[PDB]
DNA sequence: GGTAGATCCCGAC
DNA sequence: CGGGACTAC
């Protein structure tokens, strides 16, 4: 899930958790579980505690327990579901947090890529994978200054700075793509080489882009096919070390 | 310190 | 082969 999905998830299951006391924690792939190291820890600690909330941090899931919080992401395929104790569980269903009213919260992943991190709330900012988190793309805090402040600064392109977890918090593949498709920047572009006017433009379709979808795609996956805007086949190539999808016409 | 690289998984190729 | 977010050049 992308950071709109995981925003849809944290709206979502908020009101099916919240109150709930934790009765058990079943894991059946320990590498999941990274703080504690020790699953047996993590388990422990969590039962007894109540669940308060669930804040979004970029792509992370912050729940909210009496003394802890849970850090949680998803990474591409995982997912979370409620249901009854009383029924089998899904395929590929990692961890299980057992509520004393005879409801589970689950957590699927069929690859196996997602992470779990508990630490007294007051540490879990400062502590990964929290800390060195960038700003919420649709927070004041994420400006165009600060986005010019970090293009200046390296030699990377443009689409490996806007990848950067410390730049901004949660930009996925398919955003960066599609945000510098609508911006005109080619994401090969050192980011250095970006004027001030191509820097502001890439923050307004950023947020626009980002934010359109919390609340069509022009080449994500579209490799082949003709630009929405132009007509020229959409191209494919890496870049950042991932799959990159641009025009080569409306993007310079 | 900045940057790349190794790292995990397993279904679709 | 791909992909989000500790180790070594
Ligand atoms: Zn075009």
């Known amino acids: 899930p992308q950071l709109p999905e995981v925003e849809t998830i944290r709206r979502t299951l908020l009101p099916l958790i919240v109150g709930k006391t934790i009765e058990d ?31 979004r941090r ?39 947090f057992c509520f004393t009213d005879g409801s589970e919260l689950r957590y699927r992943d069929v690859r196996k890529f997602g992470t779990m991190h508990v630490y007294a709330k007051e540490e879990a900012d400062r502590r990964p994978p ?18 010019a402040e970090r293009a200046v600064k390296t030699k990377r392109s443009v689409k490996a700075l806007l990848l950067d977890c410390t730049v901004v ?10 945000s510098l498709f609508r911006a005109g920047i080619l994401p090969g572009r050192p980011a250095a080489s970006l004027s001030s006017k191509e820097i502001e433009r ?18 994500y996956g579209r490799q082949g096919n003709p630009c929405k805007r132009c007509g020229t086949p959409i191209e494919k190539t890496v870049v950042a070390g991932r799959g990159t999808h641009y025009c080569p016409r409306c993007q310079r």
């Not at 699953?39 to 422990?44: N, Q, T, Y």
């Not at 802890?68 to 997912?79: Q, Y």
């Not at 960038?134 to 927070?139: N, Q, R, V, Y």
């Open 130 to 147: 929290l800390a060195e988190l960038g700003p919420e793309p649709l927070s004041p805090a994420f400006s165009p200054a600060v986005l």
């Open 25 to 55: 924690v079943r894991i059946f792939w320990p590498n999941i579980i990274r703080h504690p190291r020790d699953s047996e820890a993590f388990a422990a600690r969590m039962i007894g505690q109540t669940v308060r909330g669930l804040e």
């Open 169 to 178: 918090a949660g930009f996925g593949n398919i955003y960066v793509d599609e």
């Open 58 to 96: 970029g792509k992370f899931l912050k729940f909210l327990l009496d003394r802890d919080a849970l850090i949680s992401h998803l990474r591409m395929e995982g997912r979370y579901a409620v249901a009854s104790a009383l029924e089998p569980l899904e395929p590929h269903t990692h961890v299980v």
């Open 202 to 219: 890439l923050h307004e379709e950023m947020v626009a882009t980002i934010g359109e979808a919390v609340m069509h795609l022009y080449v």
